DNA sequence: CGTAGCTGAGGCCTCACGATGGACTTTTTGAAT
DNA sequence: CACCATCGTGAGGCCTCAGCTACG
């Protein structure tokens, strides 16, 4: 069972920002100007929180990780006003 | 033979297929050709390029394209889904259950290892000033042990005799240093091969042995052979039992020789080691200096597998592996080992 | 002699937990991760992976705070890499880090870790130290839990050393735990297969529901003949004509399939290699040219057993009988359940069912492989003769099957091409699954090795042809995935447009990720997981652990 | 019963941004550089989504509203790496 | 009067477009009840 | 389709605040 995580950050050093944008494209897909949506099971959430405890500087950065739900029933939990919202789908890439 | 491996050193390179030919280009400018008649594995170094048409033409002819990093670190193979090599693997597995197969190849490997050891004695003996030659009693002793290895009855006897002879070689290994005892680099004749290295010289020896084992593993897997099913050593626990079986002749030439190179060239010094309650381990700068040294020894050319054409060591390994698969399945009797 | 290496003390920790677990992890490699192994590595890495002070050889009076200290004694027979060593002058004490809370047991430390700490304590005593104690430093609450080297604790440790030595030298993998609560989290439950081996080895129970797979992704299919797959760090961007068509997250990718003249930049290949993500090169039409390997699979017992049994005739014969009997049974079942007639034809003709069942049984009583191949041919001929009976309620425009056009190189029917593509694209799945369990996909018992078709994937796919390949073809034609316009003629025969290939591949993927219920164990398992489970059960059967291979007849 | 909502926006016109920062301080408390946490019952969530359908321009802005949970059990659902996270308290 | 409202100056966030480069390291450890 | 993908410096676009004018 996988969950849908929403990750939003404030990073106060451009190098650390590059490092974190690096890592986050490693894990989820871009959603908003500083927000990523990640569809992860347990192993990968452990990996993500391991990565973002060494990418960031705990003194002045801020990363927020929200566990919306079981990633099958997230659509009632998210309401988007501008663009459409479409959760990450677990299917192969055929192209 | 049939052909030889092609090593594409240039990270710039772009490799295409020209009909029956494999063309190397540099900057839209040609470099060299292979032409697939005398080819073997195509080794591509870091960020080289191999056009997918050329890759398909390699696969259809069942040529083991191998990918190395820019430095030369192995990263993987690319084998074809044809019976080219499964014949070799099934011959290896069917024949590993035999007593003369195991015993005979073991006897050959040990006699070659001993011969390389004594030849390295007569090469690199540095008891200089008063003992320009090794004691011929030692040389006669190792010759006698070599005959004994020729006529060992069974595997356990060969293992015991091998251990003996290797020990009496290591008795005078320290005799081969910069001229005397290497105070600051002490060598223990008896604490050999325990898992943590208790001596700096033994640390170098173990690290060189491990790198040689890795090279032999990748060379064996390049050909269609299972490195983990050995004839002389024992298979399980994750030990590569065929790399360990075949690296025995090559221990003096690539491991002992590399250590002697890097210790008689001052590359490795007492300051490079850290000692801890029974463990002497290298420092990082020293570790990768020694890796460079192991490369430099692997880059040298030696001429005579059986055909005199001055191959680098890293390709002599493949030549030997192919000779092994060719001994199996019954082409060439008795696997003509490489001895200098 | 060298009949056994020095026992790593972590394998000593595992042996007192589950002897089968120690056997798997030590004598056959065979490790896999889950939530907790990954979490524990994460705990240990940030501090104790990096070294620290050395344990002084000459100890008089000074604090010893060594970290990641590697000892071994060969009189004892163990080797260790102690997480930390706290000692005042000459009285040292091992400290092992853990991951979770303090356990809810008397003494705060379970039986295994106590044995590990005692073993490390003996090792320290060997090198001239006075330990007489140890600790467990749980990283989460850093609640150091002391452990005292009681005497029968040392008795347990030495007994476990001897027990592991004997069970490794014997060469017989110890049975699984009996319905234990340890197993549902041992991170090898996908390899131990505890309940399945229990049930089939006649220690009969009811297999508990699948301890589900975790941390595995879905394939990457590159069907476009002008795609360029390049690395973009951890993603993997597939750009076609210099525009980003799609990205694939490498953490979520489990294979790569390169169809035709699709290029893969060498850096992307290296990054795939660093993760052992299999990369498979295919022709434009699905021919399986080659794949990527890396210095073999460290499990040797599996391959040794496979080859040694391959050199045995009646083992090959029994396996082949099982396989094609399963194939014929599945063909019958498919013919039934998806026959679509109108009236007096809407349900299967029993004469055909008589012929097919009689052929099933004639194969079950086969004398040798020659007659078995003959019977397989005859039954497949009848099945395909009636195959067209049951798609779209009859042939459509151009969607014409010719039963005599099967089994040869250029497909000159639309549906013949569709079948050949499905077969050649299931062979890849089977090859990957078989190579991922330590087996050698090319040494087969029934089929003979020939280019592009590994002899063992062709074997173990025989039961699954009707369930996956033919079922995908049927569902694709019926649902309207493919109509006649999707095909293009050629001098060779028939082929599919890109719009057809993408839709068909998506359909095949949906089939592979489509849950079923196992006839024998009765739990919902996807087909992709089922292939791995069946490969593992074949390894067990060749191992002599279970009496016979479960063929999955439905 | 009240729920905890997390609201995050991208606004491409400074006037609309002022209008929305206006409205959002009307409803919840600042959390991150463009994120507000709101503890609202049903009437107030209806009010908020009514306000942010006329503050923003649907063509090019983007406002995201996440319903974490019942606002009593939100703490297991939110993990903050930098500053502390403390939900809105009704007192 | 006071709070609604608009301007600047700085701080986050990302992208197209450039130049360097040229990682990879022994064996162990790593959960679970 | 010419080494290829990590590093990183500019120019613009979001996001907020302090300081102003009007004002009622
Ligand atoms: S279920 Fe897992 S832990 Fe239990 S005996 Fe089997 S492999 Fe070992
Ligand atoms: Mn942000
Ligand atoms: Mn030896
Ligand atoms: Mn067949
Ligand atoms: Mn924002």
mmCIF file with all atom_site columns, C-alpha atoms in Angstrom, chain C residues 100-260:
data_model
loop_
_atom_site.group_PDB
_atom_site.id
_atom_site.type_symbol
_atom_site.label_atom_id
_atom_site.label_alt_id
_atom_site.label_comp_id
_atom_site.label_asym_id
_atom_site.label_entity_id
_atom_site.label_seq_id
_atom_site.pdbx_PDB_ins_code
_atom_site.Cartn_x
_atom_site.Cartn_y
_atom_site.Cartn_z
_atom_site.occupancy
_atom_site.B_iso_or_equiv
_atom_site.pdbx_formal_charge
_atom_site.auth_seq_id
_atom_site.auth_comp_id
_atom_site.auth_asym_id
_atom_site.auth_atom_id
_atom_site.pdbx_PDB_model_num
ATOM 1   C CA . UNK C 1 100 ? 13.696 0.897   17.376  1.00 0.00 ? 100 UNK C CA 1
ATOM 2   C CA . UNK C 1 101 ? 12.338 1.394   20.863  1.00 0.00 ? 101 UNK C CA 1
ATOM 3   C CA . UNK C 1 102 ? 13.348 -0.682  23.834  1.00 0.00 ? 102 UNK C CA 1
ATOM 4   C CA . UNK C 1 103 ? 11.611 -4.052  23.374  1.00 0.00 ? 103 UNK C CA 1
ATOM 5   C CA . UNK C 1 104 ? 8.947  -5.190  25.806  1.00 0.00 ? 104 UNK C CA 1
ATOM 6   C CA . UNK C 1 105 ? 10.836 -8.191  27.180  1.00 0.00 ? 105 UNK C CA 1
ATOM 7   C CA . UNK C 1 106 ? 12.564 -9.109  30.423  1.00 0.00 ? 106 UNK C CA 1
ATOM 8   C CA . UNK C 1 107 ? 16.025 -7.593  30.288  1.00 0.00 ? 107 UNK C CA 1
ATOM 9   C CA . UNK C 1 108 ? 15.126 -5.288  27.416  1.00 0.00 ? 108 UNK C CA 1
ATOM 10  C CA . UNK C 1 109 ? 17.070 -7.294  24.828  1.00 0.00 ? 109 UNK C CA 1
ATOM 11  C CA . UNK C 1 110 ? 15.875 -10.216 22.750  1.00 0.00 ? 110 UNK C CA 1
ATOM 12  C CA . UNK C 1 111 ? 17.734 -13.500 22.555  1.00 0.00 ? 111 UNK C CA 1
ATOM 13  C CA . UNK C 1 112 ? 19.538 -12.759 19.250  1.00 0.00 ? 112 UNK C CA 1
ATOM 14  C CA . UNK C 1 113 ? 21.202 -9.415  19.982  1.00 0.00 ? 113 UNK C CA 1
ATOM 15  C CA . UNK C 1 114 ? 22.292 -10.715 23.373  1.00 0.00 ? 114 UNK C CA 1
ATOM 16  C CA . UNK C 1 115 ? 24.132 -13.509 21.570  1.00 0.00 ? 115 UNK C CA 1
ATOM 17  C CA . UNK C 1 116 ? 25.670 -11.064 19.109  1.00 0.00 ? 116 UNK C CA 1
ATOM 18  C CA . UNK C 1 117 ? 26.943 -8.881  21.948  1.00 0.00 ? 117 UNK C CA 1
ATOM 19  C CA . UNK C 1 118 ? 28.341 -11.880 23.799  1.00 0.00 ? 118 UNK C CA 1
ATOM 20  C CA . UNK C 1 119 ? 30.136 -13.033 20.648  1.00 0.00 ? 119 UNK C CA 1
ATOM 21  C CA . UNK C 1 120 ? 31.711 -9.620  20.163  1.00 0.00 ? 120 UNK C CA 1
ATOM 22  C CA . UNK C 1 121 ? 32.627 -9.728  23.838  1.00 0.00 ? 121 UNK C CA 1
ATOM 23  C CA . UNK C 1 122 ? 34.458 -13.016 23.396  1.00 0.00 ? 122 UNK C CA 1
ATOM 24  C CA . UNK C 1 123 ? 36.266 -11.557 20.397  1.00 0.00 ? 123 UNK C CA 1
ATOM 25  C CA . UNK C 1 124 ? 37.397 -8.587  22.472  1.00 0.00 ? 124 UNK C CA 1
ATOM 26  C CA . UNK C 1 125 ? 38.533 -10.946 25.226  1.00 0.00 ? 125 UNK C CA 1
ATOM 27  C CA . UNK C 1 126 ? 40.581 -12.805 22.622  1.00 0.00 ? 126 UNK C CA 1
ATOM 28  C CA . UNK C 1 127 ? 42.652 -9.738  21.717  1.00 0.00 ? 127 UNK C CA 1
ATOM 29  C CA . UNK C 1 128 ? 43.659 -9.077  25.319  1.00 0.00 ? 128 UNK C CA 1
ATOM 30  C CA . UNK C 1 129 ? 40.854 -7.078  26.902  1.00 0.00 ? 129 UNK C CA 1
ATOM 31  C CA . UNK C 1 130 ? 38.527 -7.380  29.885  1.00 0.00 ? 130 UNK C CA 1
ATOM 32  C CA . UNK C 1 131 ? 34.947 -6.881  28.726  1.00 0.00 ? 131 UNK C CA 1
ATOM 33  C CA . UNK C 1 132 ? 32.522 -8.773  31.002  1.00 0.00 ? 132 UNK C CA 1
ATOM 34  C CA . UNK C 1 133 ? 29.669 -6.682  29.620  1.00 0.00 ? 133 UNK C CA 1
ATOM 35  C CA . UNK C 1 134 ? 28.141 -4.818  26.740  1.00 0.00 ? 134 UNK C CA 1
ATOM 36  C CA . UNK C 1 135 ? 25.315 -2.517  25.783  1.00 0.00 ? 135 UNK C CA 1
ATOM 37  C CA . UNK C 1 136 ? 22.606 -1.944  23.183  1.00 0.00 ? 136 UNK C CA 1
ATOM 38  C CA . UNK C 1 137 ? 22.283 1.711   22.200  1.00 0.00 ? 137 UNK C CA 1
ATOM 39  C CA . UNK C 1 138 ? 18.877 2.129   20.584  1.00 0.00 ? 138 UNK C CA 1
ATOM 40  C CA . UNK C 1 139 ? 19.300 5.128   18.299  1.00 0.00 ? 139 UNK C CA 1
ATOM 41  C CA . UNK C 1 140 ? 15.642 6.173   18.456  1.00 0.00 ? 140 UNK C CA 1
ATOM 42  C CA . UNK C 1 141 ? 15.528 6.737   22.213  1.00 0.00 ? 141 UNK C CA 1
ATOM 43  C CA . UNK C 1 142 ? 19.277 6.366   22.947  1.00 0.00 ? 142 UNK C CA 1
ATOM 44  C CA . UNK C 1 143 ? 18.290 4.293   25.930  1.00 0.00 ? 143 UNK C CA 1
ATOM 45  C CA . UNK C 1 144 ? 21.466 2.289   26.466  1.00 0.00 ? 144 UNK C CA 1
ATOM 46  C CA . UNK C 1 145 ? 20.435 -1.160  27.680  1.00 0.00 ? 145 UNK C CA 1
ATOM 47  C CA . UNK C 1 146 ? 23.307 -2.988  29.410  1.00 0.00 ? 146 UNK C CA 1
ATOM 48  C CA . UNK C 1 147 ? 23.900 -6.699  28.889  1.00 0.00 ? 147 UNK C CA 1
ATOM 49  C CA . UNK C 1 148 ? 25.991 -8.843  31.224  1.00 0.00 ? 148 UNK C CA 1
ATOM 50  C CA . UNK C 1 149 ? 27.893 -11.820 29.815  1.00 0.00 ? 149 UNK C CA 1
ATOM 51  C CA . UNK C 1 150 ? 26.242 -14.419 32.007  1.00 0.00 ? 150 UNK C CA 1
ATOM 52  C CA . UNK C 1 151 ? 27.803 -17.851 31.799  1.00 0.00 ? 151 UNK C CA 1
ATOM 53  C CA . UNK C 1 152 ? 25.101 -19.762 29.945  1.00 0.00 ? 152 UNK C CA 1
ATOM 54  C CA . UNK C 1 153 ? 24.873 -16.799 27.599  1.00 0.00 ? 153 UNK C CA 1
ATOM 55  C CA . UNK C 1 154 ? 28.390 -17.775 26.542  1.00 0.00 ? 154 UNK C CA 1
ATOM 56  C CA . UNK C 1 155 ? 27.137 -21.347 26.461  1.00 0.00 ? 155 UNK C CA 1
ATOM 57  C CA . UNK C 1 156 ? 24.421 -20.284 24.032  1.00 0.00 ? 156 UNK C CA 1
ATOM 58  C CA . UNK C 1 157 ? 26.928 -18.391 21.905  1.00 0.00 ? 157 UNK C CA 1
ATOM 59  C CA . UNK C 1 158 ? 29.362 -21.270 21.518  1.00 0.00 ? 158 UNK C CA 1
ATOM 60  C CA . UNK C 1 159 ? 26.503 -23.701 20.953  1.00 0.00 ? 159 UNK C CA 1
ATOM 61  C CA . UNK C 1 160 ? 25.206 -21.455 18.183  1.00 0.00 ? 160 UNK C CA 1
ATOM 62  C CA . UNK C 1 161 ? 28.653 -21.282 16.599  1.00 0.00 ? 161 UNK C CA 1
ATOM 63  C CA . UNK C 1 162 ? 28.831 -25.067 16.502  1.00 0.00 ? 162 UNK C CA 1
ATOM 64  C CA . UNK C 1 163 ? 25.250 -25.373 15.274  1.00 0.00 ? 163 UNK C CA 1
ATOM 65  C CA . UNK C 1 164 ? 25.803 -22.950 12.407  1.00 0.00 ? 164 UNK C CA 1
ATOM 66  C CA . UNK C 1 165 ? 29.004 -24.715 11.455  1.00 0.00 ? 165 UNK C CA 1
ATOM 67  C CA . UNK C 1 166 ? 27.292 -28.078 11.274  1.00 0.00 ? 166 UNK C CA 1
ATOM 68  C CA . UNK C 1 167 ? 24.228 -26.838 9.428   1.00 0.00 ? 167 UNK C CA 1
ATOM 69  C CA . UNK C 1 168 ? 26.430 -25.130 6.850   1.00 0.00 ? 168 UNK C CA 1
ATOM 70  C CA . UNK C 1 169 ? 28.641 -28.169 6.317   1.00 0.00 ? 169 UNK C CA 1
ATOM 71  C CA . UNK C 1 170 ? 25.638 -30.476 5.972   1.00 0.00 ? 170 UNK C CA 1
ATOM 72  C CA . UNK C 1 171 ? 24.328 -28.691 2.898   1.00 0.00 ? 171 UNK C CA 1
ATOM 73  C CA . UNK C 1 172 ? 20.623 -29.000 3.728   1.00 0.00 ? 172 UNK C CA 1
ATOM 74  C CA . UNK C 1 173 ? 18.670 -25.818 4.292   1.00 0.00 ? 173 UNK C CA 1
ATOM 75  C CA . UNK C 1 174 ? 16.804 -26.063 7.597   1.00 0.00 ? 174 UNK C CA 1
ATOM 76  C CA . UNK C 1 175 ? 13.005 -26.001 7.436   1.00 0.00 ? 175 UNK C CA 1
ATOM 77  C CA . UNK C 1 176 ? 11.055 -22.778 7.916   1.00 0.00 ? 176 UNK C CA 1
ATOM 78  C CA . UNK C 1 177 ? 9.707  -21.712 11.266  1.00 0.00 ? 177 UNK C CA 1
ATOM 79  C CA . UNK C 1 178 ? 6.347  -23.193 12.192  1.00 0.00 ? 178 UNK C CA 1
ATOM 80  C CA . UNK C 1 179 ? 3.745  -20.501 11.563  1.00 0.00 ? 179 UNK C CA 1
ATOM 81  C CA . UNK C 1 180 ? 5.856  -18.029 13.491  1.00 0.00 ? 180 UNK C CA 1
ATOM 82  C CA . UNK C 1 181 ? 5.239  -14.302 13.903  1.00 0.00 ? 181 UNK C CA 1
ATOM 83  C CA . UNK C 1 182 ? 8.902  -13.681 13.085  1.00 0.00 ? 182 UNK C CA 1
ATOM 84  C CA . UNK C 1 183 ? 8.456  -14.553 9.416   1.00 0.00 ? 183 UNK C CA 1
ATOM 85  C CA . UNK C 1 184 ? 6.011  -11.805 8.290   1.00 0.00 ? 184 UNK C CA 1
ATOM 86  C CA . UNK C 1 185 ? 8.812  -9.257  8.591   1.00 0.00 ? 185 UNK C CA 1
ATOM 87  C CA . UNK C 1 186 ? 12.091 -11.122 8.028   1.00 0.00 ? 186 UNK C CA 1
ATOM 88  C CA . UNK C 1 187 ? 12.742 -9.247  4.762   1.00 0.00 ? 187 UNK C CA 1
ATOM 89  C CA . UNK C 1 188 ? 13.383 -12.591 3.083   1.00 0.00 ? 188 UNK C CA 1
ATOM 90  C CA . UNK C 1 189 ? 9.828  -13.870 3.418   1.00 0.00 ? 189 UNK C CA 1
ATOM 91  C CA . UNK C 1 190 ? 9.658  -13.281 -0.314  1.00 0.00 ? 190 UNK C CA 1
ATOM 92  C CA . UNK C 1 191 ? 12.579 -15.692 -0.675  1.00 0.00 ? 191 UNK C CA 1
ATOM 93  C CA . UNK C 1 192 ? 12.078 -18.061 2.247   1.00 0.00 ? 192 UNK C CA 1
ATOM 94  C CA . UNK C 1 193 ? 8.490  -18.636 1.116   1.00 0.00 ? 193 UNK C CA 1
ATOM 95  C CA . UNK C 1 194 ? 7.714  -20.068 4.544   1.00 0.00 ? 194 UNK C CA 1
ATOM 96  C CA . UNK C 1 195 ? 4.049  -20.957 4.307   1.00 0.00 ? 195 UNK C CA 1
ATOM 97  C CA . UNK C 1 196 ? 4.272  -22.182 0.724   1.00 0.00 ? 196 UNK C CA 1
ATOM 98  C CA . UNK C 1 197 ? 7.138  -24.559 1.451   1.00 0.00 ? 197 UNK C CA 1
ATOM 99  C CA . UNK C 1 198 ? 5.388  -25.707 4.612   1.00 0.00 ? 198 UNK C CA 1
ATOM 100 C CA . UNK C 1 199 ? 2.182  -26.458 2.731   1.00 0.00 ? 199 UNK C CA 1
ATOM 101 C CA . UNK C 1 200 ? 3.742  -28.257 -0.227  1.00 0.00 ? 200 UNK C CA 1
ATOM 102 C CA . UNK C 1 201 ? 6.263  -30.208 1.829   1.00 0.00 ? 201 UNK C CA 1
ATOM 103 C CA . UNK C 1 202 ? 3.196  -31.892 3.394   1.00 0.00 ? 202 UNK C CA 1
ATOM 104 C CA . UNK C 1 203 ? 3.665  -30.234 6.779   1.00 0.00 ? 203 UNK C CA 1
ATOM 105 C CA . UNK C 1 204 ? 0.256  -29.167 5.685   1.00 0.00 ? 204 UNK C CA 1
ATOM 106 C CA . UNK C 1 205 ? -1.272 -25.911 6.910   1.00 0.00 ? 205 UNK C CA 1
ATOM 107 C CA . UNK C 1 206 ? -3.427 -23.262 5.276   1.00 0.00 ? 206 UNK C CA 1
ATOM 108 C CA . UNK C 1 207 ? -1.072 -20.683 3.705   1.00 0.00 ? 207 UNK C CA 1
ATOM 109 C CA . UNK C 1 208 ? -1.552 -17.341 5.396   1.00 0.00 ? 208 UNK C CA 1
ATOM 110 C CA . UNK C 1 209 ? -2.258 -14.420 3.055   1.00 0.00 ? 209 UNK C CA 1
ATOM 111 C CA . UNK C 1 210 ? 0.625  -13.154 0.959   1.00 0.00 ? 210 UNK C CA 1
ATOM 112 C CA . UNK C 1 211 ? 3.040  -11.096 2.979   1.00 0.00 ? 211 UNK C CA 1
ATOM 113 C CA . UNK C 1 212 ? 2.907  -8.528  0.191   1.00 0.00 ? 212 UNK C CA 1
ATOM 114 C CA . UNK C 1 213 ? 5.834  -7.444  -1.925  1.00 0.00 ? 213 UNK C CA 1
ATOM 115 C CA . UNK C 1 214 ? 7.328  -4.049  -1.158  1.00 0.00 ? 214 UNK C CA 1
ATOM 116 C CA . UNK C 1 215 ? 9.694  -1.585  -2.786  1.00 0.00 ? 215 UNK C CA 1
ATOM 117 C CA . UNK C 1 216 ? 9.552  -2.712  -6.404  1.00 0.00 ? 216 UNK C CA 1
ATOM 118 C CA . UNK C 1 217 ? 8.526  -0.628  -9.389  1.00 0.00 ? 217 UNK C CA 1
ATOM 119 C CA . UNK C 1 218 ? 7.140  -1.098  -12.882 1.00 0.00 ? 218 UNK C CA 1
ATOM 120 C CA . UNK C 1 219 ? 9.008  -1.501  -16.174 1.00 0.00 ? 219 UNK C CA 1
ATOM 121 C CA . UNK C 1 220 ? 10.079 1.139   -18.648 1.00 0.00 ? 220 UNK C CA 1
ATOM 122 C CA . UNK C 1 221 ? 9.024  0.422   -22.219 1.00 0.00 ? 221 UNK C CA 1
ATOM 123 C CA . UNK C 1 222 ? 10.727 2.321   -25.024 1.00 0.00 ? 222 UNK C CA 1
ATOM 124 C CA . UNK C 1 223 ? 8.856  1.354   -28.174 1.00 0.00 ? 223 UNK C CA 1
ATOM 125 C CA . UNK C 1 224 ? 9.418  4.466   -30.277 1.00 0.00 ? 224 UNK C CA 1
ATOM 126 C CA . UNK C 1 225 ? 12.071 3.719   -32.924 1.00 0.00 ? 225 UNK C CA 1
ATOM 127 C CA . UNK C 1 226 ? 13.520 7.238   -32.615 1.00 0.00 ? 226 UNK C CA 1
ATOM 128 C CA . UNK C 1 227 ? 13.735 7.753   -28.865 1.00 0.00 ? 227 UNK C CA 1
ATOM 129 C CA . UNK C 1 228 ? 16.782 8.928   -26.928 1.00 0.00 ? 228 UNK C CA 1
ATOM 130 C CA . UNK C 1 229 ? 16.894 7.921   -23.266 1.00 0.00 ? 229 UNK C CA 1
ATOM 131 C CA . UNK C 1 230 ? 19.294 10.083  -21.292 1.00 0.00 ? 230 UNK C CA 1
ATOM 132 C CA . UNK C 1 231 ? 20.058 10.600  -17.626 1.00 0.00 ? 231 UNK C CA 1
ATOM 133 C CA . UNK C 1 232 ? 18.845 13.664  -15.750 1.00 0.00 ? 232 UNK C CA 1
ATOM 134 C CA . UNK C 1 233 ? 20.229 12.776  -12.348 1.00 0.00 ? 233 UNK C CA 1
ATOM 135 C CA . UNK C 1 234 ? 17.782 10.389  -10.716 1.00 0.00 ? 234 UNK C CA 1
ATOM 136 C CA . UNK C 1 235 ? 15.023 10.738  -13.269 1.00 0.00 ? 235 UNK C CA 1
ATOM 137 C CA . UNK C 1 236 ? 15.563 9.251   -16.723 1.00 0.00 ? 236 UNK C CA 1
ATOM 138 C CA . UNK C 1 237 ? 14.267 11.537  -19.453 1.00 0.00 ? 237 UNK C CA 1
ATOM 139 C CA . UNK C 1 238 ? 13.176 9.959   -22.726 1.00 0.00 ? 238 UNK C CA 1
ATOM 140 C CA . UNK C 1 239 ? 13.384 12.655  -25.375 1.00 0.00 ? 239 UNK C CA 1
ATOM 141 C CA . UNK C 1 240 ? 12.232 12.078  -28.941 1.00 0.00 ? 240 UNK C CA 1
ATOM 142 C CA . UNK C 1 241 ? 13.195 14.547  -31.654 1.00 0.00 ? 241 UNK C CA 1
ATOM 143 C CA . UNK C 1 242 ? 14.805 16.782  -29.005 1.00 0.00 ? 242 UNK C CA 1
ATOM 144 C CA . UNK C 1 243 ? 11.610 17.204  -26.947 1.00 0.00 ? 243 UNK C CA 1
ATOM 145 C CA . UNK C 1 244 ? 10.991 15.618  -23.550 1.00 0.00 ? 244 UNK C CA 1
ATOM 146 C CA . UNK C 1 245 ? 8.336  12.979  -24.147 1.00 0.00 ? 245 UNK C CA 1
ATOM 147 C CA . UNK C 1 246 ? 8.367  11.468  -20.659 1.00 0.00 ? 246 UNK C CA 1
ATOM 148 C CA . UNK C 1 247 ? 10.451 11.035  -17.524 1.00 0.00 ? 247 UNK C CA 1
ATOM 149 C CA . UNK C 1 248 ? 10.945 7.848   -15.519 1.00 0.00 ? 248 UNK C CA 1
ATOM 150 C CA . UNK C 1 249 ? 11.995 7.867   -11.878 1.00 0.00 ? 249 UNK C CA 1
ATOM 151 C CA . UNK C 1 250 ? 14.836 5.411   -11.401 1.00 0.00 ? 250 UNK C CA 1
ATOM 152 C CA . UNK C 1 251 ? 13.737 4.531   -7.884  1.00 0.00 ? 251 UNK C CA 1
ATOM 153 C CA . UNK C 1 252 ? 10.388 3.461   -9.323  1.00 0.00 ? 252 UNK C CA 1
ATOM 154 C CA . UNK C 1 253 ? 11.679 1.643   -12.418 1.00 0.00 ? 253 UNK C CA 1
ATOM 155 C CA . UNK C 1 254 ? 12.212 -2.113  -12.301 1.00 0.00 ? 254 UNK C CA 1
ATOM 156 C CA . UNK C 1 255 ? 13.283 -2.955  -15.870 1.00 0.00 ? 255 UNK C CA 1
ATOM 157 C CA . UNK C 1 256 ? 14.069 -1.266  -19.164 1.00 0.00 ? 256 UNK C CA 1
ATOM 158 C CA . UNK C 1 257 ? 13.024 -2.573  -22.573 1.00 0.00 ? 257 UNK C CA 1
ATOM 159 C CA . UNK C 1 258 ? 14.563 -0.979  -25.659 1.00 0.00 ? 258 UNK C CA 1
ATOM 160 C CA . UNK C 1 259 ? 12.587 -1.774  -28.799 1.00 0.00 ? 259 UNK C CA 1
ATOM 161 C CA . UNK C 1 260 ? 14.250 -1.381  -32.162 1.00 0.00 ? 260 UNK C CA 1
#
